[PDB]
Nanobody, 124 residues
Framework: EVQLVESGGGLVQPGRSLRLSCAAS????????IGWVRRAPGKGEELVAR????????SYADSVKGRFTISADTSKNTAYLQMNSLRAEDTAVYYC??????????????????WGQGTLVTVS
């Protein structure tokens, strides 16, 4: 089974902190870049954070930089999202995501897929 199960979330007052996790199963995270996408109420998905476990290279959304930090633990095949100084505009459903690129005829397909069971992060 290929799965990317999330944990954490909940109701929180602005300025407080939350920590999410992405437990990966069925595939190695070194060949992908894993992270989070958020779905604001009445909006499509947008990238939150993304880490390349092979290089620990990070990427964040501009409205998130300086406040969220993403890290990986390949020994457990999990990533972590430390959400500090939460704001009311961070209120969304957050989903564990993964990104990939592989030629099926060069240049190939750039791919993104996220697990459908997200967690609700609401800022009071």
């Amino acid at each position: 089974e290929v799965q990317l199960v999330e944990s954490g979330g909940g109701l929180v007052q602005p300025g407080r902190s939350l920590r999410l996790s992405c437990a990966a199963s069925g595939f190695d995270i070194d060949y992908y870049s894993i992270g989070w996408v958020r779905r604001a109420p009445g909006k499509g998905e947008e990238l939150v954070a993304r880490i390349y476990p092979s290089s620990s290279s990070t990427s964040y959304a501009d409205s998130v930089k300086g406040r969220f930090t993403i890290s990986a633990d390949t020994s457990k095949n999990t990533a972590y999202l430390q959400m500090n100084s939460l704001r009311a505009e961070d209120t969304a459903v957050y989903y564990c995501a993964r990104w990939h690129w592989a030629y099926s005829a060069w240049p190939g397909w750039y791919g993104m897929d996220y697990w459908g069971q997200g967690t609700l992060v609401t800022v009071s």
